[PDB]
Amino acid sequence: DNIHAVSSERWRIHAATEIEDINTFFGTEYSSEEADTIGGLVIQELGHLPVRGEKVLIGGLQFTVARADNRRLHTLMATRV
Amino acid sequence: ADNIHAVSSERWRIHAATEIEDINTFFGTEYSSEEADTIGGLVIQELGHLPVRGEKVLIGGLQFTVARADNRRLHTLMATRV
């Protein structure tokens, strides 16, 4: 699973998860104009490839970077605001 | 290999064999039973019989709906918050 529930209000999410799938899962309306994937959306929002422990708020969800390297973002943790 | 599957952010598909303590960790609930060790066991206790698909049990601020069950086993519950 690309979106894994760690607990009822916390999700471990592969960066490659399609934005469409995030939107269906969460009831969000994130745009896919500038990205295909949630990792891509996070990078677009921050303007820069983030580091482990960095958090970004997008709509009503907070994404925390769980695993990233100098090349790629691989995993995010999400919770509600 | 996941026992509690989130189908959407507010809805979960749960294996009936999932241990009650693991349900409690996941949801913050405090379920207990001296007759059952699994969430399926608890649902059977509450309903007083082996249920069929569509039967519902409300406990501890969660609603469990029987998603799959036959004449021998209760397999799967769907949970939502009340």
Added chain:
Amino acid sequence: SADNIHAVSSERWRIHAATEIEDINTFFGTEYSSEEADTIGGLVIQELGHLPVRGEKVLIGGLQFTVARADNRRLHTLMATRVK
């Protein structure tokens, strides 16, 4: 049991191959990571180079994984112990 990582005794575990690598890491305190694998079965296949048969073993970090159930399609179950 319903455990994806099932202790058969205090120091030996039967593990569903489909267990996510992150859930292995939480359980064991390992820091496994793959660019190309998301599950422990995937990681075993990566480290061995091929789909293994029952009885094949691989050491990854401080854990030894032996194949317990596999077929011509899939690796299903592993038995793990801590390296000595």
Added chain:
Amino acid sequence: DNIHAVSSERWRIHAATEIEDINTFFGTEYSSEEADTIGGLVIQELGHLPVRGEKVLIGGLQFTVARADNRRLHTLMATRV
């Protein structure tokens, strides 16, 4: 499973677990001369019915009380000393 691994070195144990079963799983040599369940043995070693958080070292395992009430001990967490 009356003895469930939460993590590789921490186990959730039903208080009603027979002492013999503890011995099989851990290689302990606890005896059943008085209590014959692990919850009974914890109470016997402490000398009273414990509350959540109480710990007793028995041989090479530490048992911490995880769920108890004013009448019964239900769940223990074990770790190695």
